[model samples]
Target chain A: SPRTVEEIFKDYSARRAALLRALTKDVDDFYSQCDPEKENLCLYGHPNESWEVNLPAEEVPPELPEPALGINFARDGMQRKDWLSLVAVHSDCWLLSVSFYFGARLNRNERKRLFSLINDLPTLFDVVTG
Target chain B: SPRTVEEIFKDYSARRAALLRALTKDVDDFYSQCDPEKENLCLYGHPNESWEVNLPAEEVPPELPEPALGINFARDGMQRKDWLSLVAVHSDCWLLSVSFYFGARLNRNERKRLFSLINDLPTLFDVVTG
Candidate 1:
């Protein structure tokens, strides 16, 4: 049967609402992992707020003081690594910001991948927002 | 005035040779900086001979244990931050391969910029080779 205009509108609205809800859940889950006291981890978000932190310079250990590096010819290379973290924010009732961090033990491949992901963020963000 | 193809080729060849020589010098400089005994720096070249070192787990200090992350909608964003390093390789006697590195203390902007630069390497290589 041919679909009515009202039915099509109803389905579109429902799908849009569901997508927003899913996006909210993903953002919240990311923030929950940023607590420093609990996980001793910093998230990538706002500079002062958003639970982002860096290892103090004086506290940097000799072994894991720096990040790793590498080159990637792939389009989505950064999505493969599990060594980094992220933070996302919303403004004006919309997702407004995002941030990232790396672990001391992460390797060159991981770092490069993370960087690639961050660089491609605008496209990803647009996908999410739309 | 009439111009000769030989003169043009001569000038072009000289320029090409100079460029190759400059590239070699840059590579050498990068390698000299990768000494474990002197700078304790790990370069992003070969796995064994290149003096690329990773932070030992037990030696990692509390501070500066990981890399930073961020999003950049801008082109050439990674070039700004000094958070990463690169190793380019040549295949079949032609300039070809490249690698990269990241520091734990490096931030998201740096990493993203590095990735973007690396991602754009094929075009750069073509420019060089041509």
Candidate 2:
């Protein structure tokens, strides 16, 4: 039988949980950080000791030139709003560049819209580089 | 901003309404009937004078051989349940035999399920005849 919409959401949630589990290693490595108040730290790959850490609003050194990859985080204007993350990958050797944005402040509708846009990122990059 | 699921449903409903309007003439022709109580009649193509009208649960003639086309209507077991209509088309002139069932009693989920099944009927018949 075709699933009801609510059932579909339940199934999606379950699948999302499974997917998070399956990709735990990568996610941990990519998004490692500590919730200082919670005393929880995500420790995975060795910290990039060579790369200097900067505050979210800090400007990068202009002389460093555009990075082969870059990621930025920002806070929404509203108080208590969730953070937003932006990622960019620009590698001349790879003949492709990609950009992605995810905002934790997003409501369900906004999340779906953002997800759809993100889903088309590969095709967008393909057209740009191909 | 992303579109909410409700927005998606709204879009689908609009499209469905448009589709129904576009196919109105054909639908009127295919299911033409009169409602004496409502004093409403749907008149289209000439009535099939040669075809027999059988009430629900009535037995078809056993000796007349199978028809090139056949259709039947049945009420759901419950009084409040909606009516269901079934159609079957069989012809020696064509290699395929097709059958379909549509029920008005179906809830959203049941309707979706039945619709998926009915949507595949053409392919099902193709496999049978191929």
Candidate 3:
């Protein structure tokens, strides 16, 4: 029989748990050294690095709806606020990931806003980056 | 001083190294359980999960260019083949990530092709996922 929603949710939770576990050290390290004021210039800066950046929570209006799961990211353009919202949520992962790659630095208020948001919604990055 | 490309490359290399190291256990565990024929049904099946899928390497044509780093994925659609190509390249990260979340199952030929591609280009997933 096909998997039920309950079963799938259980499975997803398990997988997310594992992914988070694996990411622990890197994530921790990034947080340890993160600086909010630095600018990230990867592509225009390096051929070997992957691209990433920070977006302050304020940039993504809280009223803007979180994007749906199956949304086609590549072929879709959201309201700039929605895009900024996505960027803000994904910033949690970006800080760690970019730090892992190089300077995963944040712009202006990104560090404060992200830390606050994550403190309020711990799973924000886990949900968005996945 | 502005970071030089060489300095940036070094930082990127170090970061990639750390990220890969952290991902090692998850990647290993996923490879241990990966099955190439099973279909993933999370979103249509689960609320707690993120969206994901596998595209056989054959679906992604070789001639399609690897996307530019800053290409806006949200506002872009490649030839179906280009889309498929991005999907395939991103699959390495997907397998481990999805497996961490649920069943990182592959479509037909995915395992073989991804293994072959990674064997030839070890940094493929690190480059694509970052």
Candidate 4:
């Protein structure tokens, strides 16, 4: 039987929801591995073409480590300049656009000292077409 | 329970798979609504800036309409330079990368005359993890 546009839309919706979940998980994993003590991240120069990061001007006892460039998403070719975060890119209609949101990382203490989630839910989305 | 890395990976995989299916459907819808007779498409001017296109010098009776720039994706600052087709953009790690591909268009006339997809399983993937 032919499908309704609503059905089609739902399917895509599910797909995107899943995608957001998946990517959020990835992000969570990354933060979990991060040194919480090292709370800041800084990028220097152009990442697309050999970029660098900024180091603290002076050491403050235990030298803090800025968030080094984590997983790189926008790689090579004309990339969307703004929008922030790991970006997924592809297109057939001269463009490709995707958006997602997810809650991640426990902020409050689970057993006791654990903090709840640093963030409840953050959203990230993009619209790109060639 | 703390999720295992393997579990996380599977989740992302499923998400990406669903995304591909969803996008494939969208692409299918597009072609279905397209002027198949107008098989060719062209974009004029740099979408981000000022760009023009290459239209056929002469019209052949029906006057085929080169594919007018459809939904645009690669919009805004620092976009992926090259990734044929519509592209999605967003970043947090300083970059975002998503890839997808799907079987599209039929050629069999009964559907038999269907062209069996302008192209089959054309893979579109990009890795932009900032």
Best candidate, DockQ-wise? 1
Residue A79 error for model 1, in Å? 25
Candidate 1, position A26, lDDT? 54
Residue-by-residue lDDT tens digits, candidate 3, A9-124: 33333433433432343343322222323432111101122221233222111111111121122212445334323332333332222221221122223323322332232443
**lDDT tens string, model 2, A1-130?**
1133333333333333332331232334333332223322111111121222122221211111112122222212212111111111111111110011112122334434433332332321122222
Q: What TM-score against the true fold does each predicted structure earn?
A: 0.25, 0.16, 0.19, 0.21
- Single out the weakest 10-residue window by summed lDDT for candidate 1 chain A: A92-101
What docking class should model 1 receive?
incorrect
Give one digit per residue, the lDDT tens place, for model 1 in B1-130: 1123333223323333433332344545433343324422322222122322233222211211221111111112334221222111111011111111112122446435434443342321233333
DockQ of 1: 0.07
Each model's C-alpha lDDT? 0.27, 0.22, 0.27, 0.24
> What is the per-residue lDDT of model 3 for residues B95-128, given as tens digits with 9 covering 90 to 100?
2222211211222233233223222334434343
Report the poorest 10 consecutive residues by lDDT, candidate 4 chain B.
Answer: B92-101
Q: Model 1 clash tally? A: 28
Residue B29 lDDT, candidate 1, scale 0-100: 48
lDDT of 1 by residue, A1-130 (tens): 1123333223323333333333354545533343334423322222222322233222211211222111111212334222222111111011111111111123345434543443343322233433
Candidate 2 chain B weakest ten by summed lDDT: B92-101
lDDT (Cα, 0-100) at B55 in candidate 3:
28
Lowest-sum lDDT 10-residue window in model 1 chain B: B90-99
Q: Write the per-residue lDDT of candidate 4 for residues A7-125, one digit (tens) a residue.
A: 32333344434434423444343333333234232232221222232332232111111122221222222232321222221111001122110101111122011101111112223
